């Protein structure tokens with residue numbers, strides 16, 4: 001089931017991502033650089049360890065994690081958060097928490113695409129990736 | 133020490149570029165990296181980006197060979213997939229002023245010591261007596 005996600009994925013469309021970063025509290029200059037980037041997302045599994053890398057001109061990131069186990073993460077916009085990632089309706093669902101706030105990032109397969117739905121306080125961004 | 137800013141870390145915080153490399157092929161040979169992969173890894177000259185946010189330390193390495201990133205607390209064991217795809221248990225401490233990382237997997241172990249020496253960050257990697265040395269300076 002994790003293998004539905006394993007691979008290299010290139011970004012293909014992006015909707016409401018600006019509004020979403022705005023709720024998150026990302027600054028103006030960062031919001032415009034991040035918005036132009038068009039990153040790859042790479043997913044791998046080594047045993048019970050999952051790795052998501054994201055790569056672009058803006059920033060290279062990587063989280064390594066076990067499903068269902070809280071871990072510390074520094075996001076690309078520099079929030080220090082607690083994340084838990086679960087497999088949930090066949091989707092990887094990540095909840096990020098910091099300073100009383102939370103955001104949910106859902107990665108789900110739909111046809112040959114990987115759809116990423118980030119939500120915070122009503123504002124939903126959608127980003128679609130295809131295989132490389 | 134060596135050092136630094138306000139913390140004993142912060143001697144390490146910044147962006148570093150590879151400046152020289154020694155016995156790195158041999159080091160990789162002892163670790164079990166395959167012939168073809170060693171050629172690509174050995175020619176790469178990576179940048180190393182170290183940062184701190186609270187108790188969390190991050191070491192990023194970036195090149196055409198691979199982009200990796202570890203996040204960790206000092207003195208706390210963590211799981212790590214290395215650049216050459218070993219899955220290891222890793223512990224990193226501040227010891228004689230150096231960042232000393234031990235990686236354990238399949239009964240084996242290696243030690244990466246990251247130290248300051250003048251304006252250089254010097255990385256020494258040891259596996260069964262074979263030691264490699266890689267020198268970095270600030271970008």
Ligand SMILES: Cc1c(C)c2c(c(C)c1O)CC[C@](C)(COc1ccc(C[C@H]3SC(=O)NC3=O)cc1)O2
Nearest residue numbers: 021024034039054055056058059061076077105118
């Ligand atoms: C700026 C920003 C990003 C990039 C972000 C998230 C948030 C909350 C952000 O404020 C959540 C996950 C996610 C929506 C995951 O899907 C991605 C979307 C954009 C990017 C572009 C930048 S951010 C990163 O880690 N690597 C990149 O190349 C990567 C992954 O990444």
Ligand SMILES: Cc1c(C)c2c(c(C)c1O)CC[C@](C)(COc1ccc(C[C@H]3SC(=O)NC3=O)cc1)O2
Nearest residue numbers: 163165173176178193194195197198199200215216
């Ligand atoms: C291939 C490989 C690497 C790169 C490696 C180590 C091993 C055991 C390796 O098999 C140990 C630490 C160390 C010697 C630390 O210093 C580095 C030297 C080269 C590189 C080049 C590649 S590997 C990476 O994560 N990013 C890069 O750009 C990174 C770090 O990195």
